[PDB]
Design a protein around this ligand. Structure first.
Ligand SMILES: COc1cc2nc(N3CCN(C(=O)[C@H]4CCCO4)CC3)nc(N)c2cc1OC
Length: 409
């Protein structure tokens, strides 16, 4: 699973060379204001490395949002990201208003030593994804010749290629799998992410506990299945749990999330767990709400009492947190993916906060702790992933096209 077999940046000579580098700068924004810069900071070590080892230039390219192959510079520009990178680098970032074409190529052909360039959003061109939508919202497909010419343009921007875009590594997009340079190395973020997930999934310290939260079950059946073959314990929490509780324990769940497709395979999953000796910890109590709202009336219920009158469970309860904390207590390795409550809303955040507390504690006493960033919870853990969709693929046992496209050693 690791990058052990692939060319990496640490064994790539960059002195005197232009580095074209694909990063995941697809950060959360609001009114063209960045609201979480973790993805930017995470790329800094590879960038600083290139600079400190004499790279003539570092050309950065990324997508942002899903403009679907039409320029939306007033909604999805990376310009704000150039300013943020400058502050983090403590160095000028030259921002270009496009990512391919004669002007961008001229700009990148032979820059003054040490220049850092950020290109404009790759997805302003339908050739990045290979498909998209026209200006009228009709789906469109990119044309092979134009995809080729798009790729050839990007490839002209450097002498060697580094992909540090772990967050995008599940996407076989042009900048990810289509750069035609002989040396294609993974950066430090790509390497670090893959080392942590490879350790956890191939060679974990045991007991190995997976904490799987989130909402829907149907789309996580493969994930759960694969994890049941690797873990010793598994917490199944968040909206997902109600499907298991209704099916396995006859629980009355009110209007709580229920996955009819998921319910059909629940017993199969649990049979697999029991055969494998995996201890499953589901919630035993809940914070309830009379409506799906931040300011709903709240209540408390257990599995035994049921969730009442059209009410829904939006967080686990105090006793669930204890069960979770015991499982965390027993873990030497933890992978946490998906939230266990609706923690954006403070009345339903307690479950998540207690659990993060337990996971931070475990780290302090030597537990290897891997959490997702963003959807899972709100640097006192071993590894916070920058890739949610991408890590999900890894957890399901799938291949990362961004990783396969790299040169072997
Ligand atoms: C217990 O943890 C969770 C519960 C979640 N529940 C929900 N829903 C969303 C769908 N729901 C509704 O539409 C309401 C409105 C009347 C029917 O119930 C209620 C349940 N959604 C979610 N996104 C939930 C997420 C959760 O944790 C991550």
């Amino acid at each position: 699973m690791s990058l052990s077999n692939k060319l990496t940046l640490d064994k790539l000579d960059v002195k005197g060379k232009r580095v074209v580098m694909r990063v995941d700068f697809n950060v959360p924004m609001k009114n063209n204001q960045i609201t979480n810069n973790q993805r930017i900071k995470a790329a800094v070590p590879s960038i600083k490395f290139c600079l400190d080892n004499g790279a003539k230039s570092v050309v950065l390219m990324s997508h942002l949002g899903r403009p679907d192959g039409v320029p939306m510079p007033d909604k999805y520009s990376l310009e704000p990201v150039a300013a943020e990178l400058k502050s983090l680098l403590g160095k000028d970032v030259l921002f270009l208003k496009d990512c391919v074409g004669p002007e961008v190529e001229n700009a990148c052909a032979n820059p003054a030593a040490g220049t850092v360039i950020l290109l404009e959003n790759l997805r302003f061109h339908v050739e990045e994804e290979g498909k998209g939508k026209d200006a009228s919202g009709n789906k469109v497909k990119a044309e092979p010749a134009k995809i080729d010419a798009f790729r050839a343009s990007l490839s002209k921007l450097g002498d060697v290629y580094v992909n540090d875009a772990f967050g995008t590594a599940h996407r076989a997009h042009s900048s990810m799998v289509g750069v035609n340079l002989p040396q294609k190395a993974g950066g430090f973020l790509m390497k670090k992410e893959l080392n942590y997930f490879a350790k956890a999934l191939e060679s974990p310290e045991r007991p190995f506990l997976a904490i799987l939260g989130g909402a829907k079950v149907a789309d996580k059946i493969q994930l759960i299945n694969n994890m049941l073959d690797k873990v010793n314990e598994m917490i199944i929490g968040g909206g997902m749990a109600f499907t298991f509780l209704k099916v396995l324990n006859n629980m009355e769940i009110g209007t709580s999330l229920y996955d009819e497709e998921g319910a059909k395979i629940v017993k199969d999953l649990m049979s697999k767990a029991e055969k494998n000796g995996v201890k499953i910890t589901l919630p035993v109590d809940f914070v309830t709400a009379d409506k799906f709202d931040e300011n709903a009336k709240t209540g408390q219920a257990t599995v035994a009492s049921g969730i009442p009158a059209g009410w829904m469970g939006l967080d686990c309860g105090t006793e669930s947190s204890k069960k979770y904390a015991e499982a965390v207590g027993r873990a030497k390795q933890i992978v946490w993916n998906g939230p266990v409550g609706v923690f954006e809303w403070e009345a339903f955040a307690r479950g998540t906060k207690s659990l993060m507390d337990e996971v931070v504690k475990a780290t302090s006493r030597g537990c290897i702790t891997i959490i997702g960033g963003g959807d899972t919870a709100t640097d006192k853990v071993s590894h916070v992933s920058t890739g949610g969709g991408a890590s999900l693929e890894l957890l399901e046992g799938k291949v990362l096209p961004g990783v396969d496209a790299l040169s072997n050693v």
